[PDB]
Amino acid sequence: IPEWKQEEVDAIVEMIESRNTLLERALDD
Amino acid sequence: GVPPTAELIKDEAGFETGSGEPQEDFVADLSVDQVKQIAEQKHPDLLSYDLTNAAKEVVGTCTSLGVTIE
Amino acid sequence: PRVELEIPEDVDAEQDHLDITVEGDNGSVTRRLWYPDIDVSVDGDTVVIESDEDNAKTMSTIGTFQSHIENMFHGVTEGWEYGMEVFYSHFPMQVNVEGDEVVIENFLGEKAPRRTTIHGDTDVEIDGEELTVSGPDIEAVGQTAADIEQLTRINDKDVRVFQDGVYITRKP
RNA sequence: GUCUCGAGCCCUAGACAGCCGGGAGGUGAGCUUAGAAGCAGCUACCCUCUAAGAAAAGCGUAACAGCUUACCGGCCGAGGU
Ligand SMILES: [Mg+2]
C-alpha cells in the first residue's frame, strides 16, 4: 500500500464532509 | 489589454537591463507595498482565486532576475 | 491451454478435420489451421483452440489462431477495406480492372502494361484517383492491396525523385 | 531459438503495453540578440491552477507554428518488469 494513495484518500474524505478507485474508496468511508 | 509582468518590474525599480547571472548578482529592489500594487492589476491573466497567491506569481520572476526584497 | 471465442449472431461456422469455414453476410472464408497438438473445434456457439502443451512455440500459434478466427468473423460481417491513392508526376498513369486482374498502363512512360492478378473473391473498385480493395478474407485482400503497391516497384532509379505509383492510404 | 532454476522490484487502492482524453497559466522566463518565444549560447531552473503538465526529454522552423516525451486522468483486466 503506497503512502501517497493513503494521503490522497485522507484528502478526498476531507472534501466530502465539507482516480475513480480513490473516489470509490473515499465514498465507502 | 494589460501589459506583461517583466516590464512592470522595470518601471518601479529604475533599472532597464537585468544581469549576467540571476540571484547571484543583485540589481533592482522592491518593497512589501510595491508588490501589492501589481497584484491588483492582473485578474483575468492569473488563475489565482485569492490576492495572497497572486503575489507569489509576481515574485516568481523577481528573485530569478536580481531583485532583493526588504 | 484453452481459449474460447464466442461466435457473433451474424456469423455461423462449421468445421471438418483441420479446415474451418466461416460464413456470414459479406461472404465465406475457409482456412486450414494445422500445428502440433493444437485442436481447433466448434462447441455449438464457441470456437475452442486448445492444447495439452504450454511451451513458447505452442503459445505463439494458439495466439495466431485466435487472431485468424477473429479476423474471419470481422471479414464475413463488416469486411476488410484497404484504401489506395494513385500518384503521378509527369506521366499520366492509367489504372484499370481488366477482368480478374488490375492493369496499370503508361507507368513512368512504359509502353508495356504492368499487371497483377486479384486473389480470390476480392473486389477492387476504382473512383478516378482512389482505389478501394475489399473482401472477406484478410489474407486475399491484404495481398491484393500489397500486390498493387509492389507492382510499381522501382529498383533501378532513386525512389525519392521517381515517386510515381499507387500507395496504401488506409489500413483497417 | 527453446527449456530449467534463483534474486530484486511493481500489481485488483488496477501493474506492463496499447488506444482515447489532458498535456493548462504567470511568461513568448532573463541575459544575448534585428529576433530567439522548451528546444543557437549563458544563467537560473523559480509558483499559480490542479487530477496532471519541465524555466522542457526528442524531432521540427529564419523565428513562430506544428508533432509528440515527461507527468495526469479514462477504457482494459492479470500478471508484469
Ligand atoms: Mg544509376
From Swiss-Prot, chain A:
Signal peptide: none annotated. It comes from the Archaea. Coiled coil: none annotated. Forms part of the ribosomal stalk, playing a central role in the interaction of the ribosome with GTP-bound translation factors. Part of the 50S ribosomal subunit. Forms part of the ribosomal stalk which helps the ribosome interact with GTP-bound translation factors. Forms a heptameric L10(L12)2(L12)2(L12)2 complex, where L10 forms an elongated spine to which the L12 dimers bind in a sequential fashion. Has been called L10e and L10E in this organism; in this case 'e/E' is for E.coli-like, not eukaryotic-type protein. Belongs to the universal ribosomal protein uL10 family. This is Large ribosomal subunit protein uL10. The gene is rpl10.
Curated annotation (Swiss-Prot), chain B:
It comes from the Archaea. Belongs to the universal ribosomal protein uL11 family. Part of the 50S ribosomal subunit. Forms part of the ribosomal stalk which helps the ribosome interact with GTP-bound translation factors. Forms a heptameric L10(L12)2(L12)2(L12)2 complex, where L10 forms an elongated spine to which 3 L12 dimers bind in a sequential fashion. Forms part of the ribosomal stalk which helps the ribosome interact with GTP-bound translation factors. This is Large ribosomal subunit protein uL11. The gene is rpl11. The chain holds residues 67 to 136 of 162 of the full protein.
UniProtKB/Swiss-Prot annotation, chain C:
GO terms for molecular function: rRNA binding; structural constituent of ribosome. InterPro entries: Ribosomal_uL6-like, Ribosomal_uL6-like_a/b-dom_sf, Ribosomal_uL6_a/b-dom, Ribosomal_uL6_arc, Ribosomal_uL6_CS2. SUPFAM superfamilies: Ribosomal protein L6 (SSF56053). GO terms for biological process: cytoplasmic translation. Keywords: Ribonucleoprotein, Ribosomal protein, RNA-binding, rRNA-binding. Pfam families: Ribosomal_L6 (PF00347). GO terms for cellular component: cytosolic large ribosomal subunit. Belongs to the universal ribosomal protein uL6 family. This protein binds to the 23S rRNA, and is important in its secondary structure. It is located near the subunit interface in the base of the L7/L12 stalk, and near the tRNA binding site of the peptidyltransferase center. This is Large ribosomal subunit protein uL6. The lineage of its organism: Archaea, Methanobacteriati, Methanobacteriota, Stenosarchaea group, Halobacteria. The gene is rpl6.
